[PDB]
Amino acid sequence: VKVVVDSRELRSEVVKRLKLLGVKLEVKTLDVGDYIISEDVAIERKSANDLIQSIIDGGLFDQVKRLKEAYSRPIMIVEGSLYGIRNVHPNAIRGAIAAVTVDFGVPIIFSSTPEETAQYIFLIAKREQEE
Amino acid sequence: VKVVVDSRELRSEVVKRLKLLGVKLEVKTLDVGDYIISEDVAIERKSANDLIQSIIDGGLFDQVKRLKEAYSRPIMIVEGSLYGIRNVHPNAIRGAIAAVTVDFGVPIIFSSTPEETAQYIFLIAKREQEE
């Protein structure tokens, strides 16, 4: 399987696992997206803390808009637990999640670790190659 | 906000919280779906254990198919943690999740408790009423 990865992700643990899984990576500096699977499928990796921060600063919807305008089938992988992070009401997180997945129609898959994020990227890429 | 609930959910903790939130419920016996928000939006509540079981028995995709054929904008809320449940490889769960959200295009929102499931149903219903 072949995956294009944005330069900023190069030395991440995600890339390490993708390489262990035998994925062939092509590095590029992308204006949008972190991992490109096909001309239509792109993945944006976001830590739970960054998701919450983007909700606090009201920048999440602009981000999703940009992802959708660049790829017809974008996917967001939120990495890390969203529970236990105070300073923000649960409804603020829930509301944002519902908005992105149901309104914007962009899937928000949850990963517990960078290794799991890599496993998701791998299985999606494999299905793409077969498809 | 008004929500139609399937009879089998009547005495759940989800319904208890929806009532506390001031939601007006209409009970019906639905052939598909557990909570109906609009003519287009329906929600299927599934425990983590039942999701895993449906993957084991290969019945998940048939279930999603039926949800989609009944409602144009179906939503699945998986309640409970999917981690720590052996007898099934993580990739089996990940693969199923990716398939439903990306391939079938049905959002899979994750809830930690029946109370959280109710909070999601509530905020979605409210946005529907306003919309």
Side-chain angles (χ1 to χ4, degrees), chain A residues 55 60-61 64-65 68 76 91-108, chain B residues 73 75 107 109 120 123-124 127 131:
Chain A
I55 292 173
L60 177 64
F61 307 123
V64 175
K65 168 186 174 64
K68 290 183 66 173
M76 275 186 66
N91 277 331
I93 301 176
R94 300 177 181 137
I97 288 174
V100 180
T101 61
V102 183
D103 186 329
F104 285 89
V106 177
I108 290 184
Chain B
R73 303 177 67 194
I75 304 169
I109 294 175
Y120 262 115
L123 78 88
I124 292 169
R127 286 177 177 169
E131 183 179 304

Side-chain angles (χ1 to χ4, degrees), chain B residues 10-27:
Chain B
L10 237 181
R11 196 179 180 183
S12 67
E13 295 301 72
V14 176
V15 163
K16 177 187 179 180
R17 176 57 66 85
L18 289 172
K19 282 178 166 55
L20 280 184
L21 292 171
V23 179
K24 284 64 183 66
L25 302 169
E26 187 187 334
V27 183

Side-chain angles (χ1 to χ4, degrees), chain A residues 56-86:
Chain A
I56 290 176
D57 303 315
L60 177 64
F61 307 123
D62 282 311
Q63 295 178 179
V64 175
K65 168 186 174 64
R66 187 165 67 172
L67 201 65
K68 290 183 66 173
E69 301 187 315
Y71 296 96
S72 62
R73 303 177 67 194
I75 304 169
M76 275 186 66
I77 295 180
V78 176
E79 190 180 294
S81 177
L82 286 168
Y83 298 100
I85 303 297
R86 281 63 186 183

Side-chain angles (χ1 to χ4, degrees), chain A residues 2 5 10 14 21 31 40-41 45-46 49 60 68 75-76 85 100 104-105 107-108 128:
Chain A
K2 306 176 185 301
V5 59
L10 237 181
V14 176
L21 292 171
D31 297 315
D40 302 303
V41 184
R45 175 190 180 207
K46 182 140 297 179
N49 290 320
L60 177 64
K68 290 183 66 173
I75 304 169
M76 275 186 66
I85 303 297
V100 180
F104 285 89
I108 290 184
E128 173 61 11

Side-chain angles (χ1 to χ4, degrees), chain A residues 83 94-95 110 116 120 127, chain B residues 83 94-95 110 116 120 127:
Chain A
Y83 298 100
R94 300 177 181 137
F110 301 86
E116 179 157 61
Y120 262 115
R127 286 177 177 169
Chain B
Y83 298 100
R94 300 177 181 137
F110 301 86
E116 179 157 61
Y120 262 115
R127 286 177 177 169

